[PDB]
Amino acid sequence: NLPNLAAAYSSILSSLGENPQRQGLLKTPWRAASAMQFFTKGYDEMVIVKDIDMFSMCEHHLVPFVGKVHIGYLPNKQVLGLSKLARIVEIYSRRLQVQERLTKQIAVAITEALRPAGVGVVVEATHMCKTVTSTMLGVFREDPKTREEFLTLIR
Amino acid sequence: NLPNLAAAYSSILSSLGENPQRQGLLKTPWRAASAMQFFTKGYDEMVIVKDIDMFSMCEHHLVPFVGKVHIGYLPNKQVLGLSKLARIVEIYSRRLQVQERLTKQIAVAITEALRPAGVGVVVEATHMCKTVTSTMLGVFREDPKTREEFLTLIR
Amino acid sequence: NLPNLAAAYSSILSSLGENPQRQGLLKTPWRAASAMQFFTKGYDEMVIVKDIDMFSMCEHHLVPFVGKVHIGYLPNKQVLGLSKLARIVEIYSRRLQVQERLTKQIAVAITEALRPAGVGVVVEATHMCKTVTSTMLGVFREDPKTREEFLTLIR
Amino acid sequence: NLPNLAAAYSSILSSLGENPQRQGLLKTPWRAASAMQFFTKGYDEMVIVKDIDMFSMCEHHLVPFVGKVHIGYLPNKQVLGLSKLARIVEIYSRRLQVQERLTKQIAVAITEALRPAGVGVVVEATHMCKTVTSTMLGVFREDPKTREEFLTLIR
Amino acid sequence: NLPNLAAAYSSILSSLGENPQRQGLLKTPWRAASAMQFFTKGYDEMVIVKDIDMFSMCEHHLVPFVGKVHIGYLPNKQVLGLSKLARIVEIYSRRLQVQERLTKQIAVAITEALRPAGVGVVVEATHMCKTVTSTMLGVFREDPKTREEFLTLIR
Amino acid sequence: NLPNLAAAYSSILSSLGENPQRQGLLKTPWRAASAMQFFTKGYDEMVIVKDIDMFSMCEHHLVPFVGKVHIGYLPNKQVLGLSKLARIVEIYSRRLQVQERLTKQIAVAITEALRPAGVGVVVEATHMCKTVTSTMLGVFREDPKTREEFLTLIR
Amino acid sequence: NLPNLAAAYSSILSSLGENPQRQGLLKTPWRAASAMQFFTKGYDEMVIVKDIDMFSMCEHHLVPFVGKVHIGYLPNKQVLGLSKLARIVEIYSRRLQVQERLTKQIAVAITEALRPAGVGVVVEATHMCKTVTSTMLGVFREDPKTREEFLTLIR
Amino acid sequence: NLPNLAAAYSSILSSLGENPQRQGLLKTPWRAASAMQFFTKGYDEMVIVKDIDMFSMCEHHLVPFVGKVHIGYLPNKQVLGLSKLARIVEIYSRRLQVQERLTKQIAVAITEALRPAGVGVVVEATHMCKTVTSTMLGVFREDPKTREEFLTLIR
Amino acid sequence: NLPNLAAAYSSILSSLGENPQRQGLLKTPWRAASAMQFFTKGYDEMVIVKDIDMFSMCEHHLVPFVGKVHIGYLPNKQVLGLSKLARIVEIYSRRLQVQERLTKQIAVAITEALRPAGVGVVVEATHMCKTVTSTMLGVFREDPKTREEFLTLIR
Amino acid sequence: PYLLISTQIRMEVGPTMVGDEQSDPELMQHLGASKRRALGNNFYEYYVDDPPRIVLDKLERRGFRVLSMTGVGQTLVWCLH
Amino acid sequence: PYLLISTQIRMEVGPTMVGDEQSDPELMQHLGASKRRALGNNFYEYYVDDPPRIVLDKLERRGFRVLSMTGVGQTLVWCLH
Amino acid sequence: PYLLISTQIRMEVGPTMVGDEQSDPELMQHLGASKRRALGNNFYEYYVDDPPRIVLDKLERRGFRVLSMTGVGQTLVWCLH
Amino acid sequence: PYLLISTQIRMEVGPTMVGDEQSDPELMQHLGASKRRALGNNFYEYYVDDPPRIVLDKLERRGFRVLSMTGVGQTLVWCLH
Amino acid sequence: PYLLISTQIRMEVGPTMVGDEQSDPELMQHLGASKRRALGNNFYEYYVDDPPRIVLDKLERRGFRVLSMTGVGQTLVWCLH
Ligand SMILES: C[C@H](O)[C@H](O)C1=Nc2c(nc(N)[nH]c2=O)NC1
Ligand SMILES: C[C@H](O)[C@H](O)C1=Nc2c(nc(N)[nH]c2=O)NC1
Ligand SMILES: C[C@H](O)[C@H](O)C1=Nc2c(nc(N)[nH]c2=O)NC1
Ligand SMILES: C[C@H](O)[C@H](O)C1=Nc2c(nc(N)[nH]c2=O)NC1
Ligand SMILES: C[C@H](O)[C@H](O)C1=Nc2c(nc(N)[nH]c2=O)NC1
Ligand SMILES: C[C@H](O)[C@H](O)C1=Nc2c(nc(N)[nH]c2=O)NC1
Ligand SMILES: C[C@H](O)[C@H](O)C1=Nc2c(nc(N)[nH]c2=O)NC1
Ligand SMILES: C[C@H](O)[C@H](O)C1=Nc2c(nc(N)[nH]c2=O)NC1
Ligand SMILES: C[C@H](O)[C@H](O)C1=Nc2c(nc(N)[nH]c2=O)NC1
Ligand SMILES: [Zn+2]
Ligand SMILES: [Zn+2]
Ligand SMILES: [Zn+2]
Ligand SMILES: [Zn+2]
Ligand SMILES: [Zn+2]
Ligand SMILES: [Zn+2]
Ligand SMILES: [Zn+2]
Ligand SMILES: [Zn+2]
Ligand SMILES: [Zn+2]
Structure with missing residues (x-):
C-alpha cells in the first residue's frame, strides 16, 4: 500500500499546478507516504x-x-x-x-x-x-x- | 451603497477641519467605506x-x-x-x-x-x-x- | 479658594526649612494647589x-x-x-x-x-x-x- | 461642524442596511460625532x-x-x-x-x-x-x- | 514648625470644600504634618x-x-x-x-x-x-x- | 546588656578558629550585638x-x-x-x-x-x-x- | 559491598561495547558505585x-x-x-x-x-x-x- | 550481551540490601538492561x-x-x-x-x-x-x- | 569549642530579656552552636x-x-x-x-x-x-x- | 396525591415553582400559575410570584398537608400529600 | 397555618428570621421582631436577636409545632404548622 | 418494605432511579424500568424516564407511602415504606 | 420543650454540642457537659465528648424524642421535643 | 433505642456503616458487620458490604423503624428508633 499512497500523492502534486519533477519534489510522494503511515499507525x-x-x-x-x-x-x-x-x-x-x-x-x-x-x-x-x-x-x-x-x- | 458610504466619509473629512484633497486622503473615503462593510458583514x-x-x-x-x-x-x-x-x-x-x-x-x-x-x-x-x-x-x-x-x- | 490653598502651601515650604524663593519653587504653591483640587474633584x-x-x-x-x-x-x-x-x-x-x-x-x-x-x-x-x-x-x-x-x- | 458630522454618521447608518431609528441608535450619530472630534483634537x-x-x-x-x-x-x-x-x-x-x-x-x-x-x-x-x-x-x-x-x- | 505645618493643612481641608471637624479629619492636619517631615527628612x-x-x-x-x-x-x-x-x-x-x-x-x-x-x-x-x-x-x-x-x- | 552581648560574640569569633583581631572583625562583636537587639525588639x-x-x-x-x-x-x-x-x-x-x-x-x-x-x-x-x-x-x-x-x- | 557493586558496573561497561580502560572510564565503576549507595541510603x-x-x-x-x-x-x-x-x-x-x-x-x-x-x-x-x-x-x-x-x- | 547486563543488574539489587525476588523487582534486571541499551544506542x-x-x-x-x-x-x-x-x-x-x-x-x-x-x-x-x-x-x-x-x- | 559556643549563646538568650529555661529554648544554645559550625565549615x-x-x-x-x-x-x-x-x-x-x-x-x-x-x-x-x-x-x-x-x- | 413545590434559598421571596408539564390545570389555575420555558431548559414549568409560605396556606385549603421539607442545593423543596 | 423560621449554621447564636413582608403583625409583635431591609436585598423581612431554640419555645406556646427541620446551604429552616 | 428513589436537582424532569441490582423485578416491571450500567459505574441500576412525582403516584397505588424526602448533593432521595 | 444537638460529619466520633448560653444547667449536668468559648467565636456553648447516639440514648430517658434530623453544611443537627 | 446508619451518595452501592465503637455486638453480628480502622481515622467502626436498603430491610425485622433520613455532605444518614 506504500506504492498505492505514493501514486496518490504524485497525482496531488500534479493537480495543484505544481511540477512534480523538479529540485525538491522527487522523493516527495514517497516521503509523504511514509508520513501518513506514521501518522495513522495506531490501527x-x-x-x-x-x-x-x-x-x-x-x-x-x-x-x-x-x-x-x-x-x-x-x-x-x-x-x-x-x-x-x-x-x-x-x-x-x-x-x-x-x-x-x-x-x-x-x-x-x-x-x-x-x-x-x-x-x-x-x-x-x-x-x-x-x-x-x-x-x-x-x-x-x-x-x-x-x-x-x-x-x-x-x- | 458603497458610493453612499464614501460620500458620507468625505463629508466627515471636511467637517473635522481637515483637507480631503492632499497626499494621504485620496482613497480615504473609499478605503474606509470598504472597512465598515467588512466590520458589519454579519448581516x-x-x-x-x-x-x-x-x-x-x-x-x-x-x-x-x-x-x-x-x-x-x-x-x-x-x-x-x-x-x-x-x-x-x-x-x-x-x-x-x-x-x-x-x-x-x-x-x-x-x-x-x-x-x-x-x-x-x-x-x-x-x-x-x-x-x-x-x-x-x-x-x-x-x-x-x-x-x-x-x-x-x-x- | 485657589489663593487660599496657595498661601497654605507657601507656609508649608517655609516650615520645612526650605527656601520658597529659589529656582524650582516659584510656581510650587500654585502647581500644588491645582493638584489638590484635581485630586478631590469628586465633591x-x-x-x-x-x-x-x-x-x-x-x-x-x-x-x-x-x-x-x-x-x-x-x-x-x-x-x-x-x-x-x-x-x-x-x-x-x-x-x-x-x-x-x-x-x-x-x-x-x-x-x-x-x-x-x-x-x-x-x-x-x-x-x-x-x-x-x-x-x-x-x-x-x-x-x-x-x-x-x-x-x-x-x- | 458637529451637526455636519452627525448628519454624515446618520447617512452611514442608513447605507449599511441598518435602521437608524431603533432602540440603540438614537444618539449614535451624535455620540460618534463627539468621538471623532475627541480622536482628532490635536489640530x-x-x-x-x-x-x-x-x-x-x-x-x-x-x-x-x-x-x-x-x-x-x-x-x-x-x-x-x-x-x-x-x-x-x-x-x-x-x-x-x-x-x-x-x-x-x-x-x-x-x-x-x-x-x-x-x-x-x-x-x-x-x-x-x-x-x-x-x-x-x-x-x-x-x-x-x-x-x-x-x-x-x-x- | 510642626504646629506651623498643621495649621497649613487645616487651611487646605477648609479650602477644598471639606468639613475639617468630622469623623475622620480630626488628626488629619497632624498626621499629614508628620508625614511631610518624614518625606523630606534628608535635609x-x-x-x-x-x-x-x-x-x-x-x-x-x-x-x-x-x-x-x-x-x-x-x-x-x-x-x-x-x-x-x-x-x-x-x-x-x-x-x-x-x-x-x-x-x-x-x-x-x-x-x-x-x-x-x-x-x-x-x-x-x-x-x-x-x-x-x-x-x-x-x-x-x-x-x-x-x-x-x-x-x-x-x- | 549591649556589652554583655558583645563579649558573647567575641567568644564566638574565637571558638570558630577565627582571628578576632584582624582587618574586618574589629566592630564585629558590636555590629552583631546591635543586630540581635534589632532582630528581637518586639519584647x-x-x-x-x-x-x-x-x-x-x-x-x-x-x-x-x-x-x-x-x-x-x-x-x-x-x-x-x-x-x-x-x-x-x-x-x-x-x-x-x-x-x-x-x-x-x-x-x-x-x-x-x-x-x-x-x-x-x-x-x-x-x-x-x-x-x-x-x-x-x-x-x-x-x-x-x-x-x-x-x-x-x-x- | 562496594567492591561488589564496582565489579558489577565494570561488567556493564564491557557489555555496552565500550572500552572500560580509557581516558574517562577508570574511576567510573567506583564513582558510580558510590552514587547508587547515596541514591538508596534511606534503608x-x-x-x-x-x-x-x-x-x-x-x-x-x-x-x-x-x-x-x-x-x-x-x-x-x-x-x-x-x-x-x-x-x-x-x-x-x-x-x-x-x-x-x-x-x-x-x-x-x-x-x-x-x-x-x-x-x-x-x-x-x-x-x-x-x-x-x-x-x-x-x-x-x-x-x-x-x-x-x-x-x-x-x- | 542482554543477559550479560541483566545478570549485572541482579547483582546490583542484591548488593544494595534489597530483595531481588519480590513484588516489583522481577523484570527489573531486564527492564533496566534494555534501558541502558537505549541510553547508549549511538554507538x-x-x-x-x-x-x-x-x-x-x-x-x-x-x-x-x-x-x-x-x-x-x-x-x-x-x-x-x-x-x-x-x-x-x-x-x-x-x-x-x-x-x-x-x-x-x-x-x-x-x-x-x-x-x-x-x-x-x-x-x-x-x-x-x-x-x-x-x-x-x-x-x-x-x-x-x-x-x-x-x-x-x-x- | 562546641561547649564554648553553647555557653556564648546561652548568654545571648539571657541578654535579650528572654527566659532560657522554657518550652522551646532548652537545646537552643546547642542547636545554634552546631549551626554556626556548619555555616563556617570552609576553614x-x-x-x-x-x-x-x-x-x-x-x-x-x-x-x-x-x-x-x-x-x-x-x-x-x-x-x-x-x-x-x-x-x-x-x-x-x-x-x-x-x-x-x-x-x-x-x-x-x-x-x-x-x-x-x-x-x-x-x-x-x-x-x-x-x-x-x-x-x-x-x-x-x-x-x-x-x-x-x-x-x-x-x- | 403528591405535589412538590420549590423555591430558592431566601424563602421570604419568590418565585415558587408549583408544577411540571403534566400538572393539574385546575389546581394550577387556583394558585395563579403562569407557564414558561426558561432559556437553556428543555422543559416547561409552572410558577407563581408568591413566597412559598403563601402557597402553603393556599394548598392547605385544598386538602394537602406537608409531609417533608428538605433542601437540595440552593433549592428548598416541600412535599405535600 | 405554616410558618418558616431560619438561622445560620451555628444555631447557638442568632439572629433568627421569623417572617416576610406579609407576615402577621400581632405574632411578630409577640416574638419581638424588628423589620429591616438589608443592603443588596430587594425585600423586607422580620428578625429577632434570639437563638432559634428560644423562638421555638415561644411559638410552641402559640399553638405551633415543628413539622420538619432542614438545612439548605448555610441556613437551617424550621417549618411549623 | 423500604424503597429508595432518587432524581437530580430539577425534580420537574427525570430520569428517576427506582432500584438496585437486587430490586423486585415485578415492581420494577410495573414502574416501567429499564436496567443499565452507566459508564464509569461498577454496578447495575433501574431507572425510568418519568419525573419523580409521577412515580410517587404509581408507588402510592402499590401500598407505599413517603416517610422522608431529603437532598444529598445534587440528588434528591425519597424513602418509601 | 425543644432541644437542638449537633455533631460533625462523622457521627461515629464526637464532640456533640448540647446547648447554648441559656440552656438548662440541670439537664446539662446530667449529660456531662463542659462549657467553653472556642477561639474566634463570640458566644459560649455546652459540649460533651460522646458520640451523638450515646447522647440520644441519654435524652430519651429524660422524656425527649427526635422530631427531625437534618444536615446543614458538615454539621448534622437533631431536634428533640 | 437510636441507631444511625450511613452510606455515600450513590445509595445503590455500599458499603453502609452500621455502628461505632460501643455498638451492640449481637446486633452487629446479625447484620454481618466487620470492624476496621480506616487509615487516617482515629476511631473504630462497623460496616457491611450491602446497600443501605438491604440493611433497612434487616433492621425492620429487629423492631426498628426509620424516623428521618437526611443527607450531610456526600453522606446519607438514616436514623432508626
Ligand atoms: C563575512 C560574514 O561573516 C558572512 O559573509 C556573513 N555573515 C552573515 C550572514 N548572514 C547573517 N544573517 N549574518 C551574518 O553575520 N551572511 C554572510
Ligand atoms: C558623546 C556622548 O555621546 C555624550 O557626551 C554622552 N553620552 C552619554 C551620556 N550619558 C549616558 N548615560 N550615556 C551616553 O551615551 N552623557 C554624555
Ligand atoms: C580599564 C577598565 O575599564 C578597568 O580597568 C576594568 N574594567 C572592568 C573590571 N571588572 C569588570 N568586571 N569589568 C570591567 O569592565 N575591572 C577593571
Ligand atoms: C582569543 C580568544 O579570546 C580565545 O582564543 C577564544 N575565545 C573564545 C572561544 N570560544 C568561545 N566560545 N568564545 C570565545 O570568545 N575559544 C577561544
Ligand atoms: C439565582 C441566581 O443567583 C441568579 O438567578 C443567576 N445567577 C447567575 C446568572 N448568570 C451567571 N453567569 N451566574 C449566576 O450565578 N444568572 C442568574
Ligand atoms: C455570615 C457571613 O459569613 C457574614 O455575615 C458575611 N460574610 C461575608 C461578607 N462579605 C464578604 N465579602 N464575604 C463574606 O463571606 N459579609 C458578611
Ligand atoms: C447532570 C450533569 O450535569 C451532566 O449529566 C454531566 N455533567 C458533566 C459531564 N461531563 C463533565 N466533564 N462535567 C459535568 O459536569 N457529563 C454529564
Ligand atoms: C473539623 C475541622 O476540619 C478542623 O477542626 C479544623 N479545620 C481547619 C482548621 N484550620 C484551618 N485553617 N482549616 C481547617 O479546615 N482548624 C480546625
Ligand atoms: C469516595 C471517594 O470519592 C473516594 O473513596 C476517594 N476519593 C479521593 C481519594 N483520594 C484523593 N486524593 N481524593 C479523593 O477525592 N481517595 C478515595
Ligand atoms: Zn479538520
Ligand atoms: Zn488603516
Ligand atoms: Zn510632579
Ligand atoms: Zn462605544
Ligand atoms: Zn494614610
Ligand atoms: Zn551584614
Ligand atoms: Zn556524573
Ligand atoms: Zn522507571
Ligand atoms: Zn531553625
Missing part, C-alpha cells in the same frame, strides 16, 4: 498523569491537530503503569480522529483495563483546519471534592 | 472552545471593541463542529453590537442548534469608547460542579 | 467590569493611594453603561477617602441605580502612608456559585 | 521616558491604532518637563496619522524645543485596519554605546 | 548594587514619586559599604527632588567618597503628577565593555 | 491585608526566617487601621519565634482587638535552618464561601 | 510544608525520578518539626520506589508520628524512564473546606 | 536550529544528564537538512559522554559534513550527579556581528 | 557553570546572605571538573565573608588551579543585614566578544 489515592503530548490527524480535513491529554483516576484493586497510559494515548491518537471521540475512547480504555472508582480525561488541542473536551466518569462526576482535586492539580 | 462530555477571537463594532460610538469568547456546552444527542462555533461567533460579532447582547445571542444560537444540556458563554472585551459578560444556561446554572469545571478550564 | 447574565483604575486621597495623611476596583452585578430589569460605572468610581474615588468606605459607597451607588440581584465590589490598593476590601451584596452573598463565578473571572 | 545624562500611551487614528481607513512611544534624549543646556513630553505626544497622536510620520514628527518637536545632543523615538503600535518605527537622531545614531544604552533601558 | 572588580527602593517628593506638585536606583562602580583603592550606598540614597531621595537632579547627585556623592574609576547611576521611577535617567561617569562612559557589563547585570 | 465587608513582609528569628537555631503574612477579617462594630495591623505583625515577628506560634499569636491579637466575625491568618516563610501555616477562626472556618473568598484574593 | 491550625525537593530511584528501570512533595496536616496534641518532616521525606525517597507507594508511605509516617486530624500528601514528579499522586487522610477527605484550603495554598 | 544566510532536546549519559557516574543543544551555521555551498542535524545530535548524545566533548563533537560533525563558513554549538544541561558549554568555530569566532546575531536569536 | 571552548547556590555568613553582622555564583572560563591545557568548581565555591562561601572578597577569591582559586585564558566570576546575593559583584580576568577583560558571550549565556 487508595488519586493518580493524575498530565502533560501527555498528543499528535492526531483530523478525519475531516486530513490535517493534524496537536494537543495534550490529562488523565487521572482513583484505583480500586489494580493500578496501571505510567508508560502504559501513554501507549493507550498513542494507540487512539495516531489514527484519524475527532477530539470528542478521542477523549471518550481514552476514558473507556482505562475504565475496562482497571475498573477504577473514577476516570477523568481532559484533552486540549489546537485544530489547524484551543478546544477542551472532558469526560468525567465514576466518582469524578458524583463527588465535588474529587472533580475539583483533579482540576487544580492538572494546572 | 457525554463537556466541550469547551476557548480563545475565540472577536472584533465587533460598538453601536453607540461606532468604534470597535476587541475581545475573546469562551464557549462550553454539554451535548445531548447532537454535537457541533469546532469551525461552526466560530462562524456563529463571526455572524453575531461582525455587526453593530453591545457586549451584553452579543453574549446572549451566541448562547441562544448554540441552544437552538443542538438543544444541549447546558451552555456557558463568556465574553471579555476592551471597549475603546476589560468587561466580562457571562450567560450560564441549562445545567451550567443549576450544578455547581458543572459551572466550576467550565470556569477552571477556560483559564 | 439575565453577570456583568463584571474589572481593571478599573483608581487614584484616591487618604483622609488621614493626605497622601494618595493607588488601586483597582472590580465590579460585577446581576441585573434585574435595568442595566448600566460601562462608562457610567467608571464615573461612579471617579466621583467617589476623587475625594478624601478610606478604602473601606470607598468599597461600600460604590456598591450602594450601583444598588440604588439599578436595584440588581447582587453587587460585588472589590478594591485592592497600595497605601503610601496591598489591601483588599470586598462587599458582597444581594445574591453574591447567598449563593456560592455566584460568588465564585465573580472571583475567578476578575483574575 | 549631562540621558532621559528616557517610556510606556507613553498613544491612541491615534489611521488616515487611510479612519480606524484607530493603539500603541506606545519611547523617547530618550541627551540634553545640552535645556531640559524638558516629563509632562510636556506627553503633551507633545498627544498633539501629534490625536490626529489623522501614519505611524511613520508620527515617529518623525515627535523627534522633530523635541529637537526644536531643546536642541539636544541626540533624540531617540520608538513607536510600537497595533493597526486594526505590532509594527515598530524608530528615528535615531544626533548622537543616538553616531555612537554605538549611546544607541544601545537607549535600547536596553526601554525594555 | 579590581565591579560592584553593582541594584533594586534600591526610592521614595522621593516631586518639587513641582508636592506629590510623591516612586522608583528604583541602580548603582555600579569600579573601585580604585577605597570601597564603600553596601549599607552606606543606601543611606546616600535616602539622604538625597527624602527631599524635594526632580529625578534628573537625583540621579546626578547620587553619582557625585559616590565619586567624591571613593574617587573610583567609573560610576553608573540609573534611576527609573513613576511620577504620579516610568522615566529612566542615567549618568555614566568615568570609565563607564569611555569603555563599551564596561557600560554593557553594567547594563546586563542590572536587569 | 459589613471583608478586609484582606496581604503581602505583609515578615522577618523573624528562629528560636531553635537563632538564624532568621523570612516570610509573608496574609490577614483578613470580617468586622462587627470596630475596624482596625491598616498601619496598626502591621505593627501587630512587627511586635510578634521581631521575637524568637516558631512560625506555628507566630500564626496563632497574630490571630489572637486581632481577635481581642476587634472581636470580629472571623479571622484568617496565613504565614508562608522560608526557614534557613516554604512552609504555610494557617489559622481560620470564627466564620472563616464555618462558612465555605467565606474561606474561599479569602483564599482567592490573597493570591 | 489548632493547618501546617502546610511545600516545595520539598525529592530525588528517588525508580525500582523498575533503576533510573532516577525527580519531584516535589507537598505535606499538610491538622495537629491534635503533638506537632512535628519542619526539619523532621523533611527527613521523613529523605528516608522514604532515597530508596528504590514507585511514586504511588512513596506518597502513601509519607502519609503513614506522619499519621503514626502525631496521630493528627488529617494528612494530605501530594507528590508530583518527572519519570525519566509529570504525574501527581495524592493521599488525603482524616479530615482532609471528609471536609470540603479543609481539602480546598490545602489545595490553594500549595500552589 | 547566503544563517541557519540557527534551537531547542534541540538532548538526553545523554554521564560517563563518570552512569547517571543521565538532560539538556538542550543550539546549533547555528553559515553555509558556503552545501546546506544540511533540519532532521539530519537532529540525528547528528542523537548519535553523539546517546552515548557515555561529558558535556564538554559532546559540544565539540557536534561542531566537528557539522564542519566536516558541509565545510561551512562558521559553526556555533551551545549545549546547556543539568547534571544529576545548569552548565553551558560553547564552541564558536569559523566566522562565528572572528566576527562580532555574527556571534551576536547567533546569541540573540537562540534566546 | 578550546568556553565552560560556563551557572546557578551555583551559595550560602555565606556576613562578617559584619554575623547574619547570612544568600546568592548565586556564575563561573565561566576558557581552558588552555587543563580543564576542571564540574563538581570541583562547586567545592571551590563551598570552601570560600562557608566562611565569614564579604561578597566582594568572595568573588575575587573564587576567581583566584580557578586561576591557580588551571592557568586558563580567562576567568569570569559573577556573584549576585541578597544581604539580610540584590548586589552583583563581578571579576573579569584574562581574556574575559580584553575581548568584547568573550565578555559578551559570557554575559548572555548566564541569563
